[PDB]
From Swiss-Prot, chain A:
Span covered, complete protein: 18 to 467 of 605
Catalysed reactions, semicolon-separated: urea-1-carboxylate + H2O + 3 H(+) = 2 NH4(+) + 2 CO2
Function: Hydrolyzes allophanate to NH(3) and CO(2). Can also use malonamate, but with much lower efficiency.
Annotated disulfide bonds: none
Keyword Cell wall biogenesis/degradation appears in the UniProt entry: no
Subunit structure: Homotetramer.
Coiled coil: none
Alphabetical keyword list: Hydrolase, Plasmid
First-level EC class: hydrolase
Active site per database record: 74, 148, 172
Modulation of this protein's activity: Inhibited, in a time-dependent manner, by phenyl phosphorodiamidate, which forms a covalently modified Ser-172.
GO biological-process terms attached to the record: atrazine catabolic process
UniProt GO molecular function: allophanate hydrolase activity
Designated name of the protein: Allophanate hydrolase
Length: 450, 444
């Protein structure tokens, strides 16, 4: 059975035939359901055609680092031939071209099998806010998949695909990783192009990577990353930003003061986080305590501040003319921006800038920040019953990252007694993606039998 | 007149206390208004000077010892009210603004507060209830600028420098009209603490002087990181270092077909002289599409950034709109109708324009523009106060939005004696570089 990239690379080297792997994969999805993990699938014939084109180019000696690798794509991102519903039964647009990032992956030989489910318009951190059926934690169907990038995460964790693309604004590229024992690479803003992505908050959005390991996540990120002159929020990076680097024998890492950490009654998660702190200490880290307040306050501006208006801006016309196709919880949130003024926005911007300035005190004393990815997980039923508050709780340690222009990577940090996984997130400054990935990888692999 | 003339006089043995007392006398024997809103009492000034003297006597470093300056009345000076050109804006600060503090620390003495376009909203100087300051080269014409009295007070010989502010072009227009140098520093190079904001994300305290050296001398003292100002940035070392320019360089000028002088033929010809002169200094003139720069400039007042002004004075606009100058009032209160969605769409639009503009920056080392395309009479401006003012902003209003450095320097005179200025524009933190070129332009 095929799991990670290496397992596909080994199979192809041993002579397998990618066309059989893909046909088998499609078959396996058919005997199961499409929903709730998949909103649509690239027809088998188009997939095999895309593969044949890749084959021909490989045969001409072209370099194809992701040859014959199937992947899922969150349905807010364009794939040519498939509608981009973005988890909404009335947004009907079918793009002529691949999104800039998908194009680079297909250029490297990868094959996008289909579009994955999500919280509608990427507004949510749990995965229940969809009309296409509710995706579920792979470790227990009763619990939420997480994330916004819900189906993208499940499709990797259940073994269907070795990677997938998510997006991350508030934490949608990380929450679902944590709940499904995956790696979630959230690149620095502008490292990945936003062309062919239906925006949520355009100034904050990042297409993101979901995989089983950091190497795989990195392998994909290197291909996906790159400057897109047509995307005004695209930035230039280079090999420097996603390069792996060995960490010095001693370093500093920041953790919010133990006494004020927020786990919303989840004692096991608290203890598992403490394990993670120790483990990093044993790898040479000195734990620096800091006051989380300014980070919390900034995180709060995403939904309790004017940035909600970026979502309304992105779908203004649809919210005005056809509010009925919006998921009711998503609707109320997005339409609440109607009451936010230009003055409110700039005061939010001034406030944010003050919080960034306060936060510099912490960054000056650390090389990386370590947070729980999600403080606790919830059941589907509990989330449906309390869909705003419980969702906001999941965003306690995520929602400030893009606002403050940071890099993040979410990695596994073990399991609860009941089998449900728990994840931590390493956070660095802009363009420190490779650095933090390197530490995250060393963390996963200490003390990990090969 | 200039700094050197004070440094020479003090070296030759003149007492600063007599220079200051004489200066105060000269202001009294003439008018306070329309150039000055407030005057630091003579006794407080002399006291501040004595404190400087004591420190100099203990061997202290004081590069601006005994130099008087004016301060635009949107900037805090301890002891004096900060009116911002408003008769009902109460605010008398405990402390000097961060920038003013650094200047006092270097031995300078702020004589008083200068007149302005109310809440720094205007590029001409008529939008005030404290009397209308005038072009020194002809009373019939506008002083310019927003930083109106700060410019007149320097050009009229009263003080060797002054502080202005610049959001749309208020640190440059008045320089151009009064044959002065206007140094607009990169955003965040100077602290914004103790400044009444106009557009907080764009505002820059600015320097007005007779020469680039003087402007630079002041800027070096004023510049610096202020941890309490969330928009303050670290630059230091070179950012204000004066190199000298290579034998050959590229400079950008907007395409002849899109240049805009609003019927002022003499200004057009004087700009052409300025282009030729820079060519003769080794510059290759690169033509570029002004499009995105014009479009970005337009977002300042035709876009959501007007809302930064309303945010800054929201309480006063809500409770006491009557103390606002009527033209300023209508502009600022129009932001009431701008939404959060409008703002982010403006931000997205701006980012596209910045991206288009990179094509030009990639081809040039510096941009050269007319500072002001023309100049107007006070009468004409009063009669058409929105449109004619907007015209003055044609080549200025994009600079802060696009995060640029600028220095406005003289470029000669019209047949009728009215001066004309150009502005050198560079990227963020290229302040020293551009100043160096501007200086070489004024001289060779």
């Amino acid at each position: 059975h095929l799991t990670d990239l290496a397992s596909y690379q080994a199979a192809y080297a041993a002579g397998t035939d990618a066309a059989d792997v893909i046909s088998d994969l499609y078959a396996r999805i058919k005997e199961d359901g499409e929903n709730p993990i998949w909103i649509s699938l690239l027809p088998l014939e188009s997939a095999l055609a895309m593969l044949a084109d890749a084959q021909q180019r490989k045969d001409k000696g072209e370099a194809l680092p992701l040859f014959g690798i199937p992947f899922g794509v969150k349905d807010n991102i364009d794939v040519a031939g498939l509608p981009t519903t973005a988890g909404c039964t009335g947004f009907a647009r079918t793009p002529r071209q691949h999104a800039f990032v998908v194009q680079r992956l297909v250029d490297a030989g990868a094959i996008p099998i289909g579009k994955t489910n999500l919280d509608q318009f990427a507004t949510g951190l749990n995965g229940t806010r969809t009309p296409f059926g509710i995706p579920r934690c792979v470790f227990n169907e009763n619990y939420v998949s997480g994330g916004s990038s819900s189906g993208s995460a499940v499709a990797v964790a259940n073994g269907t695909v070795p990677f997938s693309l998510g997006t991350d604004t508030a934490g949608s590229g990380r929450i679902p990783a944590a709940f499904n024992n995956l790696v979630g690479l959230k690149p620095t803003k502008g490292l990945f192009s936003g062309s062919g992505l239906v925006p949520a908050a355009r100034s904050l959005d990042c297409i993101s990577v979901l995989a089983h390991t950091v190497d795989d996540a990195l392998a994909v990120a290197r291909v996906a990353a790159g400057y897109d002159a047509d995307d005004a929020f695209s930035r230039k990076a280079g090999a420097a930003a996603l390069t792996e680097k060995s960490w010095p024998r001693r370093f500093n890492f920041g953790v919010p003061a133990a006494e004020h950490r927020q786990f919303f009654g989840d004692a096991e998660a608290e203890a598992l986080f403490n394990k993670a702190v120790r483990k990093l200490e044993e790898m040479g880290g000195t734990c620096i305590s800091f006051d989380y307040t300014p980070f919390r306050q900034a995180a709060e501006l995403l939904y309790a501040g004017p940035w909600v208006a970026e979502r309304l801006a992105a779908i203004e016309s649809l919210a005005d003319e056809h509010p009925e196709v919006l998921h009711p919880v998503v609707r109320d949130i997005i339409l609440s921006a109607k009451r936010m003024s230009a003055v409110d926005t700039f005061n939010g911007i001034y406030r944010l800038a003050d919080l960034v300035r306060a936060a510099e005190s912490t960054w000056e004393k650390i090389d990386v920040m370590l947070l729980p990815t999600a403080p606790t997980i919830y059941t589907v039923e509990d989330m449906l019953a309390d869909p705003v508050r419980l969702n906001s709780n999941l965003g306690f340690y995520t929602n400030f990252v893009n606002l403050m222009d940071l890099s993040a990577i979410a990695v596994p940090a073990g399991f609860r007694t009941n089998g449900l996984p728990f994840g931590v997130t390493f956070i660095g400054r802009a363009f420190e993606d490779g650095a933090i990935a390197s530490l995250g990888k060393a963390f996963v692999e200490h003390d990990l039998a090969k």
